[PDB]
Ligand binder design. Structure first.
Ligand SMILES: NC(=O)c1ccc[n+]([C@@H]2O[C@H](COP(=O)(O)O)[C@@H](O)[C@H]2O)c1
Ligand SMILES: NC(=O)c1ccc[n+]([C@@H]2O[C@H](COP(=O)(O)O)[C@@H](O)[C@H]2O)c1
Ligand SMILES: [Zn+2]
Ligand SMILES: [Zn+2]
Lengths: 256, 256
């Protein structure tokens, strides 16, 4: 925890309220005074290729966007940046203590909120998430998400809920977004996600029953595409893509 | 959300600070005035066999204990009770808003904290957890946990951390508690846990390298026991036991 000076340079995660500053569509890299940043509080969340990445918790008029606007920067950088945004949001939600109501402060040893008056603390929360590829014979369920809009067709995902298992989270999510029923869930892998903090677990499923009834609020559209007649997909390096690949592998195994 | 009266009866989760009231070693069942409970605030967290279970957020001098003192009551009851304790702890940690510092109130529609001044809210957090059975040829790694003390020998478990995968959480936990290195992780299943709120994922692993170096703060002792010369185990119905069973099944498959 330091205060920025006139020769300070590197990567700057300037984050307010779920968004980060992205001038010219860029994650800012350079000197502090070039970014109107001198005299502010900055935390170092790590290093990219030997250069500090800083979290500055300040609002900016223009060019705030989503961290998943830097995904194609480097996954490693995105981990840093998403981690910054999460840490900013963590700090926002814990200025006061939920116990006793007096102002809290950041632990400089670890990454928690400590407390002046009382001795209770808070730690970052990890949200369990399911993600799933659904298979129906020669085809696989792909879909365009509403909030996304790159014209990509990916798999289904949703948050695990209270009192339920991964498998049940998959079944419910699939029921709600698509309106179909699945079977023979197979765990594939897991992958942490920076913002919001979450651990997604990857599942293959196969179609059991039902017709596609998209939640239009959530899904632009959903369709069964054959394993060799696919549309655009999430980029290689992403979990969703790996799942789709695994499914295509299943289909190939049966029909070729 | 109601206030208790003189003829109110049923199951009472009287919970303070991670503990619940267990008179005579019992989860209290009966009439309110019999339990000095009239005139207090009670929330209904559900029904056991058609009878209400109530959460009362009050301290009691004697006989407070751990919810995992009612595990052998009925799993369903324990879900209710553990859920009560969690909900009490949730309320304790969110009396004030972490944003703005003014007193918050419970959402009566869903189970969150709403806010008087501002419009930010909080929801219950689910903690990802790994649990793992480690296999070394004809044997399986079993261990007595320090905080437990029923003379039972169970599997290893620990909390998933930030920026890491399930598999990495397993590898690290196993490294720290036991000091050995594992390989060929296989996902088995997942199971939610009431208090503290967590979703544990079950893994089988096999021994790769190292000698047993127990964390004496965490583990009474750890040993390799053969699949047909076992000690006491966690009771049937529990995930740990199912894992141990699956492992024994592996051993039997190879050596018989
Ligand atoms: N190609 C992709 O865009 C891709 C692939 C795999 C996972 N994911 C991500 O998994 C993330 C999980 O995010 P949440 O934590 O909001 O569920 C999604 O936001 C999604 O972007 C994305
Ligand atoms: N036989 C047993 O006692 C048994 C079996 C399976 C899971 N578990 C539970 O998994 C629970 C996970 O608790 P945490 O959420 O504290 O990790 C452990 O507390 C453990 O009691 C217990
Ligand atoms: Zn406090
Ligand atoms: Zn508030």
């Amino acid at each position: 925890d330091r205060i920025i000076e006139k020769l300070d340079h590197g990567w700057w995660v300037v984050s307010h309220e779920q968004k980060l500053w992205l001038p010219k569509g860029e994650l800012p890299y350079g000197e502090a005074a070039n970014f109107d940043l001198v005299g502010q509080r900055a935390l170092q969340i790590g290093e990219w290729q030997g250069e500090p990445v800083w979290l500055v918790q300040q609002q900016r008029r223009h060019d705030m966007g989503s961290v998943r606007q830097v995904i194609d920067l480097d996954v490693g950088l995105f981990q840093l940046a998403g981690r910054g945004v999460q840490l900013a949001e963590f700090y926002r939600s814990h200025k006061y203590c939920g116990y006793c109501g007096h102002e809290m402060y950041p632990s400089k040893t670890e990454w928690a909120m400590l407390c002046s008056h009382c001795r209770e603390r808070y730690y970052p929360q990890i949200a369990p998430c399911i993600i799933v590829a659904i298979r129906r014979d020669d085809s696989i369920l792909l879909a365009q998400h509403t909030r996304h809009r790159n014209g990509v067709h990916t798999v289904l995902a949703g948050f695990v809920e209270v009192g339920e298992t991964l498998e049940q989270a998959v079944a419910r999510e699939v029921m709600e977004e698509s309106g179909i029923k699945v079977k023979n869930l197979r765990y594939v892998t897991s992958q942490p996600w920076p913002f919001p903090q979450s651990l997604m677990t990857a599942f293959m499923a196969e179609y059991d029953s039902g017709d596609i009834v998209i939640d239009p609020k959530e899904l632009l559209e959903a369709n069964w595409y054959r394993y060799d007649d696919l549309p655009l997909l999430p980029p290689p390096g992403t979990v969703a893509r790996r799942l789709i690949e695994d499914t295509v592998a299943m289909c190939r195994a049966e029909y070729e």
